[PDB]
Design an enzyme around this catalytic site. Sequence first.
Site, PDB file in Angstrom:
ATOM      1  CD  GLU A  44      38.656 -13.461 -17.287  1.00 12.48           C
ATOM      2  OE1 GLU A  44      37.693 -13.330 -16.503  1.00 12.48           O
ATOM      3  OE2 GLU A  44      39.013 -12.562 -18.077  1.00 12.48           O
ATOM      4  CB  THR A  81      34.686 -11.838 -20.348  1.00 11.84           C
ATOM      5  OG1 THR A  81      34.001 -11.007 -19.409  1.00 11.84           O
ATOM      6  CG2 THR A  81      36.188 -11.855 -20.032  1.00 11.84           C
ATOM      7  CG  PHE A 107      31.326  -6.244 -18.828  1.00 11.51           C
ATOM      8  CD1 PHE A 107      31.429  -7.560 -19.267  1.00 11.51           C
ATOM      9  CD2 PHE A 107      32.056  -5.854 -17.708  1.00 11.51           C
ATOM     10  CE1 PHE A 107      32.246  -8.476 -18.601  1.00 11.51           C
ATOM     11  CE2 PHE A 107      32.876  -6.760 -17.035  1.00 11.51           C
ATOM     12  CZ  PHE A 107      32.971  -8.074 -17.481  1.00 11.51           C
ATOM     13  CG  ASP A 160      29.206 -12.711 -12.462  1.00 21.12           C
ATOM     14  OD1 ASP A 160      30.137 -13.506 -12.704  1.00 21.12           O
ATOM     15  OD2 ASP A 160      29.294 -11.486 -12.666  1.00 21.12           O
ATOM     16  CE  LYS A 208      34.023 -14.917 -17.743  1.00 22.02           C
ATOM     17  NZ  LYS A 208      33.436 -14.198 -16.576  1.00 22.02           N
TER      18      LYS A 208
END
Length: 321
Positions: A96, A157, A179, A17, A132
Amino acid sequence: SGSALDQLKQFTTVVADTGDFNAIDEYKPQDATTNPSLILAAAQMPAYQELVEEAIAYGKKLGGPQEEQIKNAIDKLFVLFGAEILKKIPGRVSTEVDARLSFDKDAMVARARRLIELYKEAGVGKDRILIKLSSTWEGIQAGKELEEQHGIHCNMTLLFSFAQAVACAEAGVTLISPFVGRILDWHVANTDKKSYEPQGDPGVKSVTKIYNYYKKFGYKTIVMGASFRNTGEIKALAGCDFLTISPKLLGELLKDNSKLAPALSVKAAQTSDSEKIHLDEKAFRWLHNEDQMAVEKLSDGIRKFAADAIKLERMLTERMF
């Protein structure tokens, strides 16, 4: 080489990440994920100024008002990082779409196709890309449409509530990024308990519940735990399909020699208790609203990504105008 990292890889596919593509291959991850905050951070590093300069040139080339030129530059920048990342991993990279479009389904679908087209022009097939999107109701519907209508695979996400997880499953998106860390954050700042043990970590519990539900009912959407505050959370989720981890925590796992055991499995999931449910827009919005933490973390997550995108934009504007 029996590090906690190598051990983890036996039960979970490891994902890096970060936007800093020069700090990836050390951990040999399958995939990699970026987001507006990560790109902003990397775009500020001296070592990547050439990508920024190239992105600015592109924005200027297509012309139009400053907002348009900046938009094209930022998209070009996200894709440049993505393309460099793909040279460090054998799998997929997540890119994203601007969070300011989180409540506009059509705009997200359009922006997603635009990025894909930019990747194509870079010589990258959409098979290696995961677009994303914020897991709002419209983001989830944008994902479904991108998947079904264009074969564009998505990574949903800012997934916090069970309602979001169910909606994503029913939408049949390629992957979800529930998350963990930010859920712990909310509990610390909102409860009478600032410390939690791995298995007791609110974030761990959330992903655990989602994983078991997905597996118990056979949904094929990939479950990738994201956002971590410590290695304990990660170890407590060993067995999850995928786990995207920052370089910092990957380094720590690489130095850890404690023995690790799988905490999640499909077989055990088929024994879980959660009952199957279906959600139309109405049902989804109500059930999501029942989760205060989720309402607040999704909302604030959108604002933070927007804020960071705006910061990146101010950076670009100052240099190209």
